[PDB]
Amino acid sequence: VSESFVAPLEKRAENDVPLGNDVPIIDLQQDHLVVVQQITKACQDFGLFQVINHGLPEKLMAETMDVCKEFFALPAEEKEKLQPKGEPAKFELPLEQKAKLYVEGEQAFLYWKDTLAHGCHPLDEELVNSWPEKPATYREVVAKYSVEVRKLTMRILDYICEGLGLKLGYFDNELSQIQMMLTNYYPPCPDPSSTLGSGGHYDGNLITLLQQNLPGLQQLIAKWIAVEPIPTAFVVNLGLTLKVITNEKFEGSIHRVVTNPTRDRVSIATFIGPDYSCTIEPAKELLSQDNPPLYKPYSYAEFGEIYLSDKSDYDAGVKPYKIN
Ligand SMILES: CN1[C@@H]2CC[C@H]1C[C@@H](OC(=O)[C@H](CO)c1ccccc1)C2
Numbered sequence: 155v156s157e158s159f160v161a162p163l164e165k166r167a168e169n170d171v172p173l174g175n176d177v178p179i180i181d182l183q184q185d186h187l188v189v190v191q192q193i194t195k196a197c198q199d200f201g202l203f204q205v206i207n208h209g210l211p212e213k214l215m216a217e218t219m220d221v222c223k224e225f226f227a228l229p230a231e232e233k234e235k236l237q238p239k240g241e242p243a244k245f246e247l248p249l250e251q252k253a254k255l256y257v258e259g260e261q262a263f264l265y266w267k268d269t270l271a272h273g274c275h276p277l278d279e280e281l282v283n284s285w286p287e288k289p290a291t292y293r294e295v296v297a298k299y300s301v302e303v304r305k306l307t308m309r310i311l312d313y314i315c316e317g318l319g320l321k322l323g324y325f326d327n328e329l330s331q332i333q334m335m336l337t338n339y340y341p342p343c344p345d346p347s348s349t350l351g352s353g354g355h356y357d358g359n360l361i362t363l364l365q366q367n368l369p370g371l372q373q374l375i376a377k378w379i380a381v382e383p384i385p386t387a388f389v390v391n392l393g394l395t396l397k398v399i400t401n402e403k404f405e406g407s408i409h410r411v412v413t414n415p416t417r418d419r420v421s422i423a424t425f426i427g428p429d430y431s432c433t434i435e436p437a438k439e440l441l442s443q444d445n446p447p448l449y450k451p452y453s454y455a456e457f458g459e460i461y462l463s464d465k466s467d468y469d470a471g472v473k474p475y476k477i478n
């Protein structure tokens with residue numbers, strides 16, 4: 155592989171990462187209180203769990219994976235239409251909601267990944283008109299998927315509210331206003347020992363729902379485990395923003411993606427979180443002398459700039475705001 159994609163020795167993935175047998179798989183059609191308790195335990199102990207019987211149509215999940223794979227099969231001449239000034243966009247502020255293809259790495263090497271990203275909320279003609287023109291059915295399918303994934307995310311956030319003792323709808327406001335859909339394409343890699351599909355990270359936002367069909371996702375528990383792909387499940391990743399708002403009562407998910415020498419992989423990640431204008435702080439309702447705030451209030455925009463640039467540590471984004 156090109157030296158551009160060679161990860162530092164210490165960040166390279168071990169060849170035989172064991173299956174995460176303790177990754178919670180939570181049936182959302184259990185009794186209400188059982189679902190609240192199981193989600194609460196997973197959030198406190200792991201920060202990553204899967205949800206099944208989640209009420210999002212399996213047919214729509216399959217149709218969305220199909221049109222996302224069809225997009226990445228498009229020829230160069232079509233993909234160039236999403237490359238501003240002839241190259242992929244960077245994950246940097248301002249992060250626009252119009253569809254673009256993105257490159258990503260650490261500042262230095264590149265991740266073995268192409269990412270299509272666009273905003274999904276609120277859905278209006280202006281936003282959907284800025285989405286991919288091809289495939290023809292992308293806009294129709296992903297509009298429906300967007301609404302359904304948001305519905306499921308807001309259900310999970312209200313289970314989280316009951317678990318924390320926050321009023322229902324606590325996150326149904328500026329804290330969930332941005333919905334970025336990242337479709338990740340991992341082409342086959344001639345040397346998986348040297349490369350990463352995605353470097354180890356927290357998702358910086360509030361909560362992320364990840365749809366996957368194939369292996370490659372790994373979680374840090376300095377031990378890495380493999381997250382079993384369940385094609386009809388969503389992987390729920392708690393973000394660094396939720397870690398801060400819960401005053402570390404919940405864990406954030408630290409995860410990475412490894413490359414494969416034989417086959418490509420598409421994942422669909424729905425990133426829900428605050429507007430860039432938001433102030434982030436530990437929920438005052440949960441604070442006391444027994445539970446003092448571990449973070450001072452901060453600008454999400456200021457956090458965002460550090461989070462997207464500084465990868466010296468997983469929580470480099472929030473280190474400046476740590477107190478007590
Ligand atoms: C693998 N990388 C990680 C996670 C996804 C991908 C791109 C980047 O994450 C984002 O762009 C998200 C979008 O909501 C973001 C942006 C600013 C603040 C909080 C979150 C870093």
Ligand SMILES: O=C(O)CCC(=O)C(=O)O
Pocket residue numbers: 336338352357364366370371409410411421423
């Ligand atoms: O491809 C995956 O399974 C993970 C994607 C991811 O973590 C991300 O886009 O932030």
Ligand SMILES: [Fe+2]
Pocket residue numbers: 355356357391409
């Ligand atoms: Fe992620």
Ligand SMILES: [Sr+2]
Pocket residue numbers: 234237240241242
């Ligand atoms: Sr180009």
Ligand SMILES: [Sr+2]
Pocket residue numbers: 283284285
């Ligand atoms: Sr357009």
